[PDB]
Amino acid sequence: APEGVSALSDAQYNEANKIYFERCAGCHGVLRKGATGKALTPDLTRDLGFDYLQSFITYGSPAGMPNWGTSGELSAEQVDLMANYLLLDPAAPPEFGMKEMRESWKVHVAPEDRPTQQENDWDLENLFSVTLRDAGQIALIDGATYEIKSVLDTGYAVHISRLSASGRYLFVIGRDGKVNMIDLWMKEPTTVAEIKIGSEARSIETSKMEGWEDKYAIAGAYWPPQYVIMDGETLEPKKIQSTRGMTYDEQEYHPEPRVAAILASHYRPEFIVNVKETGKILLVDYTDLDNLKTTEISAERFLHDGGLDGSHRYFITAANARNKLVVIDTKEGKLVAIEDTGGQTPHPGRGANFVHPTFGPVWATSHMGDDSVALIGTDPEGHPDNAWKILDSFPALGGGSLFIKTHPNSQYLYVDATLNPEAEISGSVAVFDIKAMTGDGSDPEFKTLPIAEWAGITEGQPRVVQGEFNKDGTEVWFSVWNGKDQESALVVVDDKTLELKHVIKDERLVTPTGKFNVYNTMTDTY
Amino acid sequence: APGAPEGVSALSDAQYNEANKIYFERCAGCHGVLRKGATGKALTPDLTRDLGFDYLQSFITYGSPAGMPNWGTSGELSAEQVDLMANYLLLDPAAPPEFGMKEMRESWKVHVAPEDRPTQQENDWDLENLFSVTLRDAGQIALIDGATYEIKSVLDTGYAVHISRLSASGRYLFVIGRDGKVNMIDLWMKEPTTVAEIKIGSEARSIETSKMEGWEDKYAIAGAYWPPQYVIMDGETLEPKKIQSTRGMTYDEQEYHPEPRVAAILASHYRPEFIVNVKETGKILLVDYTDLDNLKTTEISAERFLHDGGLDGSHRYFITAANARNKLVVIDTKEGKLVAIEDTGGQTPHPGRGANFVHPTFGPVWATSHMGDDSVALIGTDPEGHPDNAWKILDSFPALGGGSLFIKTHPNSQYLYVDATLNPEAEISGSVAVFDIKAMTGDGSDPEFKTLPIAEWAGITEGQPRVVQGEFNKDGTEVWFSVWNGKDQESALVVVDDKTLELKHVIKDERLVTPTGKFNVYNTMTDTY
Ligand code: DHE
Ligand code: DHE
Ligand code: HEC
Ligand code: HEC
């Protein structure tokens, strides 16, 4: 006979529910279907049983699950409480409005007490903010000496970093919707303000319109379906907007439209918000939050990531499940084009802008579903015929590619293959010579850099991901992502010679993933 | 469960679906989507169980003179369907369904394609002086000639007809019912009729047309109570072009609200936009219809409880009542922003579209009466030539009594008319107050008023006749009033001569069943009030 499931009081259940949505939904999903963490639905957990759940919640796992009990985060009583809770049927996901954001809102160092000028000796603009995935931290690394300047605690499930337009404030967001604001002008940079904006979230961005530097920060959630405009200096929540609405094509109500990538316009004081399931791109004017102006652009469903073109005027984004690239003119506030990449599941990140030797200015993207790289024309004035059309498509290492990268001061286009099944490929990066490109139809050739081999890592499954350049565009970093219990590293490549420049290693460099150079991020250089 | 003590004659899963369909398509309009009631009584299980199957079966079969259709004896519903509804009402309230594009298109019917409609007026009616009158419990509208006073035509629209609106040119008449049913009528045909129709939700109240110079007849818009949404339709075929959900955060507490109802909807004369009131979230929306794919809107934070309202005399400022809070909200449609929020000092302001006139000492003002008291309030509406009086309550004085619904005037009149429709005393509910604008002095004393015995002038004795809403003719020389009586009783329309304040004409006809809202084609198309 199956084990008996404890009957919990209302109080116990409220408590367990509060903990779940606040501390577990970020990795296990709001309906317990899973995310980075396994599914915790009762059809699976009841088979595992109480003892097993209790053990895992207590000691955690080297693969990404925090040691709630052994870390003191949850008492022994709360651990059992949660183990029983997981045996019951999933609760209904709660809302998260102004009252809840404000309860989680904390300002550690009021603006009136922060420095008035840089007070440390660091070379701020050349710093690299690196995500340490299973450690809940970011590592600020010097771009020239390769020295770890500091390791900051943000929270479990740290995702990515973004910088305010001035380069002074560093914003980090976690999968649980936790937002950390770091003042890089302190002698010892730390979190000066924090807030939580939902149960599940992925993106954050800063105001990048001239005259609005450091004014606002915006965060988008997966749940509840909403985005929040926060004060650029204290994180005070100023305006919450629901993203629930009608799909663009079928015009049917959708109760869970997730916010994906968020960017900032350089032509108007607006935020550029992607709404995934409804295929809507919103241009949100932050000049007046009470009499709120927005442009709701009908595009294509499954919007995810994207970037601005070289002139910073057009937004190019992937509607990944439909292999489409959507283009928006941020000056006029209108959709301009929608084209198929010819590839499977385009995933550009912010993409790569460059001038092709014959086609003119173009933007590129690699794919998750295949080894192809596609180029789209981005200059309607100088190259009208090539504007917003796929001009070329050629192969790289293989499928499972996540990030393509380049820099104005470089003639090379780098492409990773992070998710490919062959370890020889997922440990390497493909490199193309822009200058050698001809647009005559022949697939350009690439050089293979054995980044993992250069790091001296073979044990475990080392996956290389995301190139990121230093301020001067001379060196490009790559993450050699390994398990928390394995050895990881950052590999620095010399752009001029395509030769190993430096290998970063430290007992603290745990599961390093996304890396963001202050200057390149604050100015949208890519 | 069925055979258990508290068990009820359960319906098969397929049967439950048929009943549920019939409920949302034909009953929620009056009984509400959660069965909590509206114009019709509540039909929740707690009350329904005590009445029992047979009572419910009989009421659905025979209806009543108070507003409930005789579904059974009319043939509307088969005898088996009445049974389904009776049982269904015993069961628990179903989850209200959504109503998207698929469902709208399915109800969309074009009776006369635009190419087959006249290219000029084919009848001899004086179209701009015509009155579109709502025949409430009859499910129809009546087109009455503004000069001869004869009923030119009676058109079926559907049970629960609410009000009428005209396109900017005056050619197309739009009528909407409480069930979200929209009828489009071509007034240029020899015999005006419904040329197009569509359903926009389960519960709805407002409809409006594009009125920005240049966009005449281009679009029509309708707002729903359920689901929480509004839809922009093609002004000539009623084709649903864009559906916007109104679900969102409250303006003040900023908490998600799952059911924000759309209240009144007006049309900007300064920009090609629609002015949409969203009740529960306290948001006023300005929706630009120049580009529906790249849709621009301005979500203005105001005050909760937005209901009805109107444009001032210059047509630039939207003045609307946040009724439960006794406030007037003022939006500048040109700049697209909140301008002011003022307490009227009365209880539950209910102006309809309001009454604009030039006060002898205050300057341009907009007035409103109240439901909760006998006070009339005046707000200054000229920021340019009377800045110190703008958006402030300049006066407040008593009229007949509480329970008032509509105040009215016209540029060619010096009289301000105020009804007292919902007042308890029939003496008052059957009469109208009339103030002499030219005699107003704004010194503090209460302006005196003449009392018109509208109901008495109609010579009606039966039922409980109530007088509601004054509406002027095109020339602004005559004002009409409705003497609203029961479905099986005698009603009438009373025409009053503005200049002498004396009875001009009394309209009676067998087909004049429960006349309520009246709209003059010209004054409605031009927003003259
Ligand atoms: C919406 C979104 C953005 C855009 C942020 C913005 O615009 O500010 C983004 C960006 C990113 C970026 C931005 C790169 C850039 O150059 O802008 C990176 C490096 C990144 C590394 C990863 N992402 Fe991220 N990512 C998700 C969503 C997103 N990722 C997921 O839904 C997904 C696929 C699963 C999940 O559970 O979170 C997920 C898993 C990952 C990873 O497994 C990655 C590889 C490593 C990690 O840290 O978890 N995501
Ligand atoms: C939202 C709304 C409007 C504005 C529409 C627009 O801007 O186009 C309106 C307008 C109106 C107008 C517009 C007058 C004008 O000059 O603009 C009239 C005459 C009117 C006669 C009635 N209304 Fe109507 N009315 C409601 C809502 C509304 N009524 C209700 O929620 C309510 C209170 C109850 C109900 O169940 O429907 C209701 C009951 C009534 C009546 O009992 C009235 C007096 C008579 C009747 O026929 O039902 N309502
Ligand atoms: C992301 C940082 C996590 C948070 C926050 C929480 N969990 Fe987790 N959990 C995570 C991962 C990546 C994994 C899988 C570990 C592995 O070895 O593959 C887990 C696993 C669990 C389990 C075990 C289930 C199984 O099928 O083995 C349980 C019972 C569990 N997690 C519970 C749990 C609770 C209750 C949390 C809130 C306090 C919680 N997790 C947070 C990642 C993350
Ligand atoms: C508005 C035009 C209505 C529509 C459409 C439907 N109903 Fe109704 N109903 C309406 C009113 C105004 C009243 C009250 C009548 C009175 O004399 O007081 C009713 C009443 C009923 C009842 C009786 C409840 C009671 O407490 O006595 C029932 C059971 C009922 N209505 C059912 C019903 C159904 C099933 C409908 C759809 C087919 C329906 N009504 C439509 C107004 C309106």
> What's the sign of the alpha-carbon dihedral A377, A380, A382, A383?
positive
Residue identifier of the C-alpha nearest atom 41 of ligand 3: A24
Q: How far apart are CA A263 and CA A245, in angstroms?
A: 21
CB contact under 8 A, A252 and B101: yes
The residue type found at B205 is: R
The residues of A annotated with a catalytic role in the active site are 24, 27-28, 65, 304, 347
Cβ atoms of B386 and B335 within 8 Å: the answer is no
Cβ atoms of A154 and A173 within 8 Å: the answer is no
In the three-class reduction of DSSP (H, G, I as helix; E, B as strand; rest coil), residue B504 is classed as strand
Q: How far apart are CA B31 and CA B50, in angstroms?
A: 18
Residue identifier of the C-alpha nearest atom 15 of ligand 1: A349
Helix H or strand E encompassing A79: helix A76-85
Residues in chain A: 526
Give strand pairing partners of B198: B182
Pick the closest to residue B346 from B410, B306, B397, B310 (CA basis). Answer: B397
Q: To test ligand 2's pocket by mutation, which of B36, B68, B134, B162 has the most ligand atoms within 8 angstroms of CB?
A: B162
Pairing, β B407-408 against β B393-398? unpaired
Is A412 in the same domain as A332?
A: yes
In the three-class reduction of DSSP (H, G, I as helix; E, B as strand; rest coil), residue B370 is classed as strand
- How many Cβ atoms from other residues are within 10 Å of residue B22's Cβ? 17
- How many Cβ atoms from other residues are within 10 Å of residue A285's Cβ? 20
Is B112 in the same domain as B87?
A: no
Say which residue the tokens 């924090």 belong to.
A194
Q: Quick one: which ligand is closest to A351's CA? A: 1
Give the CA diameter of chain B.
77
Question: How many domains is chain B built from?
Answer: 2
Cβ atoms of B61 and B32 within 8 Å: the answer is no
What interhelical angle do B45-62 and B79-90 show, nearest 10?
A: 170
Is B150 in the same domain as B172?
A: yes
Question: Which of B57, B81, B97 represents a domain boundary (last residue)?
Answer: B97
Cα-Cα-Cα-Cα dihedral of A462, A464, A470, A475, to 10°? Answer: 90
Here the CATH number for the domain that contains residue A458 is 2.140.10.20
Q: Quick one: which ligand is closest to B49's CA? A: 4
Residue identifier of the C-alpha nearest atom 13 of ligand 2: B352
Residue ranges of chain B whose CB lies within 8 Å of a chain A CB = 98, 100-102, 227, 240, 242-245, 247-249, 253-256, 291, 293-301, 336-338
Residue A60 has φ and ψ, to the nearest 5°, of 70, -160
The residue type found at A98 is: M
End-to-end CA distance of chain A: 61
Q: How far apart are CA B221 and CA B228, in angstroms?
A: 14
Token output for B245: 């959900």
Q: How far apart are CA A336 and CA A389, in angstroms?
A: 11
Q: Quick one: which ligand is closest to A262's CA? A: 1
| Burial class (CB within 10 angstroms; exposed 0-12, middle 13-18, buried 19+) of A435 | exposed
CB contact under 8 A, B248 and A244: yes
Residues ≥6 apart with Cβ < 8 Å to B207: B163, B165, B174, B175, B176, B182, B220, B221, B222, B223, B265
Q: To test ligand 1's pocket by mutation, which of A154, A205, A305 has the most ligand atoms within 8 angstroms of CB?
A: A305
Q: How far apart are CA B159 and CA B162, in angstroms?
A: 9
B23 C-alpha vs ligand 4 centroid, how far in Å? 11
DSSP 8-state class, residue A443? P
Q: How far apart are CA B404 and CA B401, in angstroms?
A: 7
Closest ligand 1 atom to residue A260 Cα is 1
List the beta strands (DSSP E) in B119-268: 131-135, 140-144, 151-156, 161-166, 172-177, 181-186, 194-199, 203-209, 219-226, 229-234, 240-245, 248-249, 256-257, 262-267
Q: Say yes or no: CB of residue B67 within 6 Å of ligand 4.
A: yes
- The method recorded for this entry reads X-ray
Q: How far is A267 from chain B (nearest CA, A)?
A: 17
Resolution in A: 2.5
Is B214 in the same domain as B87?
A: no
Residues ≥6 apart with Cβ < 8 Å to B256: A95, A97, A224, A226, A242, B247, B248, B249
Interface with B, mutate which of A99, A249, A296 (most B CBs under 10 A): A296
Residues in chain B: 529
Give strand pairing partners of B451: B433
Token output for A40: 């915790």
Q: Say yes or no: CB of residue B263 within 6 Å of ligand 2.
A: yes
Q: How far apart are CA A427 and CA A422, in angstroms?
A: 9
Find the closest chain B residue to A98 by CA distance.
B254
Cα-Cα-Cα-Cα dihedral of B329, B332, B337, B340, to 10°? Answer: -30
Is A352 in the same domain as A449?
A: yes
Cβ atoms of A260 and A274 within 8 Å: the answer is yes
Closest ligand 4 atom to residue B85 Cα is 35
A159 C-alpha vs ligand 1 centroid, how far in Å? 7
Is B114 in the same domain as B64?
A: no
Residue B50 has φ and ψ, to the nearest 5°, of -70, -25
Q: How far apart are CA B237 and CA B241, in angstroms?
A: 11
Q: How far apart are CA A140 and CA A122, in angstroms?
A: 10
CA distances from B147 to B456, B458, B512 (A): 23, 18, 18
Residues ≥6 apart with Cβ < 8 Å to A52: none
Is B448 in the same domain as B318?
A: yes
> What's the sign of the alpha-carbon dihedral A33, A39, A41, A43?
positive
Token output for B183: 């009828």
Is B40 in the same domain as B145?
A: no
In the three-class reduction of DSSP (H, G, I as helix; E, B as strand; rest coil), residue A281 is classed as strand
In the three-class reduction of DSSP (H, G, I as helix; E, B as strand; rest coil), residue B186 is classed as strand
Here the CATH number for the domain that contains residue A12 is 1.10.760.10
Residues ≥6 apart with Cβ < 8 Å to B148: none
A356-361, Cβ contacts within 8 angstroms, sequence gap of 24 or more: A356/A391, A356/A392, A356/A434, A356/A437, A356/A439, A357/A434, A357/A435, A357/A437, A357/A438, A357/A439, A358/A437, A358/A438, A358/A439, A359/A383, A359/A386, A359/A391, A359/A392, A359/A439, A360/A386, A361/A309, A361/A310, A361/A311
How many Cβ contacts (< 8 angstroms) between chains A and B?
Answer: 93
Question: Which of A94, A113, A143 represents a domain boundary (last residue)?
Answer: A94
Core vs surface per residue B462-477: b (16+ CB within 10 A) or e = eeebbbbbbbbbbebe
- How many Cβ atoms from other residues are within 10 Å of residue A342's Cβ? 14
Pairing, β A303-308 against β A314-319? antiparallel
Residues ≥6 apart with Cβ < 8 Å to B91: B8, B10, B11, B16, B45
Is B114 in the same domain as B88?
A: no
The residues of B annotated with a catalytic role in the active site are 27, 30-31, 68, 307, 350
Interface with A, mutate which of B284, B299, B303, B339 (most A CBs under 10 A): B299
Question: Which of A32, A64, A94 represents a domain boundary (last residue)?
Answer: A94
Is B39 in the same domain as B104?
A: no
Say which residue the tokens 């029961």 belong to.
B486
Q: What percent helix, strand, coil does chain B show, rounded to 5? A: 15, 40, 45
Interface with B, mutate which of A238, A291, A327, A334 (most B CBs under 10 A): A291
Q: How far apart are CA A396 and CA A415, in angstroms?
A: 7
Interface with A, mutate which of B231, B246, B254, B259 (most A CBs under 10 A): B254
Closest ligand 2 atom to residue B38 Cα is 36
Q: How far is B252 from chain A (nearest CA, A)?
A: 10
DSSP 8-state class, residue B456? H
Closest ligand 2 atom to residue B162 Cα is 47
> What's the sign of the alpha-carbon dihedral B279, B280, B284, B289?
negative
Q: How far apart are CA B12 and CA B62, in angstroms?
A: 26
Q: How far apart are CA A343 and CA A325, in angstroms?
A: 11
DSSP 8-state class, residue A423? H
Q: What is the domain range of residue A82?
A: 4-94
Give strand pairing partners of A414: A405, A431
Is A83 in the same domain as A152?
A: no
CB contact under 8 A, A294 and B297: yes
Helix H or strand E encompassing A284: strand A280-285
Residues ≥6 apart with Cβ < 8 Å to B112: B186, B189, B193, B195, B196
Q: How far is B220 from chain A (nearest CA, A)?
A: 18
- The HSE-up count of residue B262 (CA atoms within 13 Å, CB side) is 33
Q: Say yes or no: CB of residue B85 within 6 Å of ligand 4.
A: yes
Q: How far is B77 from chain A (nearest CA, A)?
A: 30
Cβ atoms of B368 and B356 within 8 Å: the answer is no
Residue identifier of the C-alpha nearest atom 2 of ligand 4: B160
Residues ≥6 apart with Cβ < 8 Å to B28: B96, B179, B202, B203, B226
Cα-Cα-Cα-Cα dihedral of B263, B269, B274, B277, to 10°? Answer: -30
CB contact under 8 A, B253 and A292: no
Cβ atoms of B504 and B478 within 8 Å: the answer is yes
Token output for B142: 């009546």
Q: What are the binding residues of B for heme d1?
A: 71, 136, 162, 165, 178, 205, 225, 353, 469, 516
Give the CA diameter of chain A.
75
Cβ atoms of B176 and B182 within 8 Å: the answer is yes
Closest ligand 2 atom to residue B134 Cα is 47
Cβ atoms of B273 and B137 within 8 Å: the answer is no
Q: Quick one: which ligand is closest to B182's CA? A: 2
Give chain B positions within 8 Å (CB) of A246.
100-101, 243-245
Of B227, B240, B295, the CB nearest to A296: B295
Q: How far apart are CA B19 and CA A69, in angstroms?
A: 54
| Burial class (CB within 10 angstroms; exposed 0-12, middle 13-18, buried 19+) of B353 | buried
Give chain A positions within 8 Å (CB) of B254.
97-98, 237, 239-240
Cβ atoms of A157 and A26 within 8 Å: the answer is yes
Pick the closest to residue A151 from A167, A131, A168 (CA basis). Answer: A131
B135 C-alpha vs ligand 4 centroid, how far in Å? 18
Q: To test ligand 3's pocket by mutation, which of A56, A67, A73 has the most ligand atoms within 8 angstroms of CB?
A: A56
Q: Say yes or no: CB of residue A274 within 6 Å of ligand 1.
A: no
Q: How far apart are CA B403 and CA A282, in angstroms?
A: 45
DSSP 8-state class, residue B210? -
List the beta strands (DSSP E) in B19-81: none
Closest ligand 4 atom to residue B88 Cα is 35
DSSP states along B382-433: -TTT-TTTBTSEEEEEE-S-SS---EE--TT-SEEEE--TT-S-HHHHT-EE
B97 C-alpha vs ligand 4 centroid, how far in Å? 21
In the three-class reduction of DSSP (H, G, I as helix; E, B as strand; rest coil), residue B351 is classed as coil
- How many Cβ atoms from other residues are within 10 Å of residue A441's Cβ? 7
Is B291 in the same domain as B425?
A: yes
CB contact under 8 A, A244 and B243: no
Q: How far apart are CA A363 and CA A327, in angstroms?
A: 11
| Burial class (CB within 10 angstroms; exposed 0-12, middle 13-18, buried 19+) of A71 | exposed
Q: What percent helix, strand, coil does chain A show, rounded to 5? A: 15, 40, 45
Pick the closest to residue A73 from A88, A57, A86, A53 (CA basis). Answer: A57
DSSP 8-state class, residue A20? I
